[PDB]
């Protein structure tokens, strides 16, 4: 049950910011429930797969592109240069959104929202969800920071150990030849003694 909260500025009331909450089960294509609130009143509407398909057919384009545009507009996924205008008639509870392009505009979508008798409940639910996600993200960040610190400490320790071992390698390389020389010299001294005894 994915959810996304965004802040928009209706053209009718540009002095205040409204909150649009879009909730979908698996993907935006299947359908989604949207809720527009302003801290005092809330309007909730639903869009199904049939409505999205009909809108895409009317606008005469592939479903994928329409879904991408809807994601960019409603979910606040707009690119560096993408202006979307949201209009909402409160008397008729008609909420539509369009894409502005230079001197032309495209009526991207429209829905008919209905008022909810208890905006307080939905406002409280939204605030509680926001607080819960904030807490979860904070806990995840703390855990990641702890893991990073542990990894850094272990990496430093292993680096020091490798620094010691790389020199120990050459130390052993040098020591082995000297040891071999000593033992071989002793054996050759025994050989010389035996040869002298034989000569005698």
């Amino acid at each position: 049950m994915e959810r996304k909260i965004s802040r928009i500025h209706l053209v009718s009331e540009p002095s205040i910011t409204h909150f649009l909450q879009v909730s979908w089960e698996k993907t935006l294509e299947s359908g989604f429930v949207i809720t527009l609130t302003d801290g005092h009143s809330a309007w909730t509407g639903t869009v199904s797969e049939s409505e999205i398909s009909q809108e895409a057919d009317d606008m005469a384009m592939e479903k994928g592109k329409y879904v991408g545009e809807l994601r960019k507009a409603l979910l606040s996924g707009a690119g560096p240069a993408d202006v979307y205008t949201f209009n909402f008639s409160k008397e008729s509870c008609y909420f539509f959104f369009e894409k502005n392009l230079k001197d032309v505009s495209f009526r991207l979508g429209s829905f008919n929202l209905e008022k909810v008798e208890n905006p307080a409940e939905v406002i409280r639910e939204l605030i509680c969800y926001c607080l819960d996600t904030i807490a979860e993200n904070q806990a995840k960040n703390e855990h990641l920071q702890k893991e990073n610190e542990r990894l850094l400490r272990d990496w430093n320790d292993v680096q020091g150990r490798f620094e010691k071992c790389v020199s120990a390698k050459e130390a052993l390389e040098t020591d082995l030849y000297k040891r071999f020389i000593l033992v071989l010299n002793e054996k050759k001294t025994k050989i010389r003694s035996l040869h002298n005894k034989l000569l005698n």
């Binding site: 272990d154 320790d157 292993v158 150990r161 071992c165």
Partner: protein
């Protein structure tokens, strides 16, 4: 060559005598690598030739090792990770009695 005559088996596998269950330990792998670097013999299979055993913070497998060593003709020793570190720091073989 300090660890030349001291073979060490490490609990880097959840199931003993099974190579498919290699663990992703952090300190254990480095300690095994250093121990083998210093001349110690590390065997992936626990055979009759094992003489020393090293176990990290995981104390769950202590009972399993204590049960296994009973059947073994020669009982190995379970030593903490501090023994090897102290040995490297002091450049000589510490007594295991202080880390058993």
């Amino acid at each position: 060559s300090m660890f030349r005559r001291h073979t060490v088996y490490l609990d880097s596998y959840a199931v003993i005598n099974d190579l498919s269950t290699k663990n992703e330990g952090t300190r254990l792998a480095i300690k095994a690598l250093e121990l083998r670097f210093h001349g110690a013999k590390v065997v992936s299979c626990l055979a009759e030739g094992v003489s020393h055993v090293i176990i990290g913070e995981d104390h769950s497998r202590v009972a399993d090792f204590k049960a296994f060593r009973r059947t073994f003709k020669r009982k190995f020793k379970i030593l903490k990770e501090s023994w090897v570190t102290d040995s490297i720091d002091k450049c000589e073989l510490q007594e295991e009695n202080q880390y058993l």
